[PDB]
Design a protein around this nucleic acid. Structure first.
Ligand SMILES: [Zn+2]
Ligand SMILES: [Zn+2]
Lengths: 144, 82, 105, 97, 54, 93, 96, 81, 108, 94
DNA sequence: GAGAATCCCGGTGCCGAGGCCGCTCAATTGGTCGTAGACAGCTCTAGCACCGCTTAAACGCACGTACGCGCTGTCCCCCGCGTTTTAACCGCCAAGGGGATTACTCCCTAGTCTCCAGGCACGTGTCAGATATATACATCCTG
DNA sequence: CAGGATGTATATATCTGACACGTGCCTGGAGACTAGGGAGTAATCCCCTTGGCGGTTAAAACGCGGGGGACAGCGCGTACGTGCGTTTAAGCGGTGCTAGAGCTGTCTACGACCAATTGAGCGGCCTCGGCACCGGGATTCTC
């Protein structure tokens, strides 16, 4: 079942590859690689991710953590991602690619109200240009 | 002093419409005294506890919470009065 | 600081439940998970009652829940009726029912 | 002329009063009854309007329940007219006396 | 096919919100997991009790 | 200025979750508050009695779950226990 | 020599209203208790005192119910208790 | 496993119970009703007793557990501690 | 050697243990603190109630030409007295039986 | 080995004071113990609820008086209150 | 009056209740302090009291009709009895699963301190419910 | 069956006022920290439960017969619902008063607590007597 869901999603991803994001087994653990979306301070960065599928997937959200350092309020140093669809708003009907798109959107629009690193959210709220510059510095430093 | 005529305050039409709400089709004429006797007994039982609650509180007036507690102690919990 | 209710994804105040437990003299000491469990139970019960009341109100073509709707929702559901069998609701009225014998034949 | 046969008015009254939630007793005589009853336990006591309303609500609910039970008993007796035998039977069964 | 498992609908369960899925996936993700509709979040707990009793 | 407390805010939030486009009267809110207080008192009292019976001194989730099983009937109790266990698990995690 | 019907009934009413013994056979009552308890937890074990307390409570409850249903049957102006009488008594007591 | 133990409550036993209740004459259909009523009552009591025992984490139902189960239904019982 | 043993019950002329009542109150999680006169009052009330019940049971037993009180005697004593019957209307007593009475309609 | 406690001795003393020449069965003694415990629990719970209602923290003689008035009916309550007041008066005087 | 059921007087044992013997564990005494409670005082809010006007509800009366009540035939179901059948009950003994204690350790909870933020008391506008009325709409009832 | 009589829900409109909404503020919740004790866990002992046996027999089951009682029916009276005309207090509203409720601040009697002392009750061990029993006489209820 859960393995069947993983295989079906892998087949659909192979049939419907995204423009930038990509992931695959390296079954219940996947490595995810996403390009830093343009029009953002992280544009051009290549971020690697680890995916851990629970035994009751898709009925439970998967365990996914960032493995590329990034300057973002909702991402800590350990790669944890504060995402509602990862914690509360998870649905089995969701797809991994939808999660990747949501991650890209959150990267384009950080949520300073529920961040993982409060200092990054502080910089984001107090100086948008400073947040963009430091985010680009981090993207070049660790994701490029 | 309040005279005993107040028991007649519960009018025959009032008892009749209470029975109507209860679902009664027709009422015998002898009911209207039995019903007010029952009501007097019930009110005595509740007010006896209410007034002793107030007396223990060393107050001169009966609050709503006293009545709520008195009803609660008889397994007749009432919602809507805090 | 993240609230315990937010951690548990609830709506009722876990801190308030804990304070009420420790002030109610129910026991000398109170475990950590007890306020969480109790808050979850209360939230679920309130959700059930409110859902039934809202269904009753929408069936009555109204948009505000009133004690009449609460009484109807409680009396119609067997489980809630059993739970609150000895509860009087102000401005609640009664469930409309007529014995079939009284109806004309 | 026009004359409703007995029973129809009773049925429509039942339907009407089972649809509303208003109080069915008059506030002033109910207050006078409460004050008369309470004066023996302790004289010159005062009451809150909310307290009197709560008493009236409880009493009306109790009477409605008693009437439902006594109507059931009267039907069990193969009748449709409530008589004090039925009320006494219901009171005795419910352990109130 | 199940809206979730995508296998052939064996005793499919239709939600009051007009959504349907296979009975195994239904019991797995609604009866014991969510009590909300997998498609439109329609909560079904009271409906769940009503149909479980029947 | 004795700041009295109720559950009106949380009840309203739950109402918004259930029926997003339905309101509630003020008097109905008082009834919900009374209901919540009554249920809380029942459960807490039963848990206290359980703790005293087992000669314990601490009220844990075990006592609350048992009290819920004692009080709520049937499928209602089943759903309530499921919810409580789920919440405790999530809070621990 | 045969007694008229109801006379031995009255004498046994007098007899049983005076004794305090149990009126149900202990072994089948215990079998019933265990059979019912199977539906909650398997392989449970019972204390003899617990079973006796259950029997006492059950007999007291049934005697009270029979008193109420006999009263209702008399109210119906007849002397034979009937399942409708039992149902009326239970419904008025609020058990159902 | 066992089944159909409810018939163990014999018709003469039910008759003795009714006689102690003060019943002069008994219909023929009273027996099935009495069986059902007693089954419901025992189910309600035993459920609570078993809940108490399993909360105490032991496999033996005790007189104190039965007494507590009765007490929580407003049916206080004396003579068992 | 501080003083001769004078129990609080002896001070109040009671038979129930005032100290045991106080210990039960402060160990029962009933309140944060317990007043001085509360155990005395509670012990007096319990003693009076037990005396009333025992007196009624003894009268019932002597009316039965017996010298020992039994649960049947206790049940009869409770049922006969209206006050105690109302106080303990929801109480079941093992080996108590019922109050012997038959409806007049059944009698020929 | 748990040293359980009951009121058997005091019940026996009261019985000897009331009926000097009457015995009591062992099973009757258990019934008396259960009755005493039940009455104690009722009165203590009522007093605790009264103290909580009045936002107090101490259970005094007044709370027990009110609990007795709430529980015992009529003549029984009057006599019990009289006895308790007399006992408290004697204890204070002593 | 005869037959069947019931209580009691009489002798007996025997078992369940009453008295005896540590001793120890719970009740008592005395001091002490932190404090919950009592008292005084002040403010003011809600309850009590009254007036007056409207009118809808209560009250009284006639009637006639549907329902309660009584009588009667019947008859079928329930009670009493007897014979047969069976499972309860008592005694006994073997096996052991499970309840109650001990130790200990350790991990959980209480406690304090600091910080703040989400809930409470407070204005608002705006929006759902009532009133009024003219409809359909349904239902009774008398033809 | 059907159309008038007569309630009754409704669509529409506007008032209106009850509730969802933004605002300042404050205390109760969250957090880091440490200490201490409640209980979770293992191992132990024994003991009460389960299961089994065989032997007795009182209790349950079946069946038959009879009678009484529940029931359907019927006739008759009456009393209760329905309507109409006549009072009349309930309700509103309005006013005015004040007594008791709520509060703050002071003061203090008092309960928790600790340390030491001691004796009342628990367990056990007797001794004996209240009562069940077996038999029979006296008594009583029913046919
Ligand atoms: Zn599926
Ligand atoms: Zn849906």
């Amino acid at each position: 079942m859960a393995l069947k869901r993983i295989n079906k999603e892998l087949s659909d991803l192979a049939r419907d590859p995204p423009a930038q994001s990509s992931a695959g087994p390296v079954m219940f653990h996947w490595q995810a690689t996403i390009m830093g979306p343009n029009d953002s301070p992280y544009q051009g960065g290549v971020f690697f991710l680890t995916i851990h599928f629970p035994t009751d997937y898709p009925f439970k959200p998967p365990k996914v953590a960032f493995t590329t350092r990034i300057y973002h309020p909702n991402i800590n140093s350990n790669g944890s991602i504060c995402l509602d669809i990862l914690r509360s708003q998870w649905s089995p009907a969701l797809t991994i690619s939808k999660v990747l798109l949501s991650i890209s959107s959150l990267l384009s629009d950080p949520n300073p109200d529920d961040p993982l690193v409060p200092e990054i959210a502080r910089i984001y709220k107090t100086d948008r240009d400073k947040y963009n510059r430091i985010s680009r510095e981090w993207t070049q430093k660790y994701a490029m | 002093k309040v005279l005993r005529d107040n028991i007649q305050g519960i009018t025959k039409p009032a008892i009749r419409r209470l029975a109507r709400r209860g679902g009664v089709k027709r009422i015998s004429g002898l009911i209207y005294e039995e019903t007010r006797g029952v009501l007097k007994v019930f009110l005595e039982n509740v007010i006896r506890d209410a007034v002793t609650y107030t007396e223990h509180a060393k107050r001169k007036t009966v609050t709503a919470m006293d009545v709520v507690y008195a009803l609660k102690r008889q397994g007749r919990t009432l919602y809507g009065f805090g | 600081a993240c609230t315990r209710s937010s951690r548990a994804g609830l709506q009722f105040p876990v801190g308030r439940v804990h304070r009420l437990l420790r002030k109610g003299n129910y026991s000398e000491r109170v475990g950590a998970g007890a306020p969480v469990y109790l808050a979850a139970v209360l939230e679920y019960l309130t959700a059930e009652i409110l859902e039934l009341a809202g269904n009753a109100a929408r069936d009555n073509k109204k948009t505000r829940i009133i004690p009449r709707h609460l009484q109807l929702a409680i009396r119609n559901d067997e489980e809630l009726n059993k739970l609150l069998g000895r509860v009087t609701i102000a401005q609640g009225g009664v469930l409309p029912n007529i014995q079939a014998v009284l109806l004309p034949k | 002329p026009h004359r409703y046969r007995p029973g129809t008015v009773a049925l429509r009254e039942i339907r009407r009063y089972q649809k509303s939630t208003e109080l069915l007793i008059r506030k002033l005589p109910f207050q006078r009854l409460v004050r008369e009853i309470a004066q023996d336990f302790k004289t010159d006591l005062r009451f809150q309007s909310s307290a009197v309303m709560a008493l009236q609500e409880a009493s009306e609910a109790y009477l409605v329940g008693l009437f439902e039970d006594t109507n059931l008993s009267a039907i069990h007796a193969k009748r449709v007219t409530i008589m004090p035998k039925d009320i006494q039977l219901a009171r005795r069964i419910r352990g109130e006396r | 096919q199940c809206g979730i498992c995508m296998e052939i609908l064996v005793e499919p369960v239709t939600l009051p919100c007009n959504h349907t899925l296979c009975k195994p996936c239904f019991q797995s993700t609604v009866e014991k997991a969510s009590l909300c509709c997998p498609f439109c979040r329609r909560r079904v707990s009271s409906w769940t009790r009503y149909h479980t009793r029947r | 200025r004795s700041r009295k407390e109720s559950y009106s805010v949380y009840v309203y939030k739950v109402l918004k979750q259930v029926h997003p486009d339905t309101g509630i009267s003020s008097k109905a809110m008082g009834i919900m508050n009374s209901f919540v207080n009554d249920i809380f008192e029942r459960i807490a009292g039963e848990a206290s009695r359980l703790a005293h019976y087992n000669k314990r001194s601490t009220i844990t989730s075990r006592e609350i779950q048992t009290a819920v099983r004692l009080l709520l009937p049937g499928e209602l109790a089943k759903h309530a226990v499921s919810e409580g266990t789920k919440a405790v698990t999530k809070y621990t995690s």
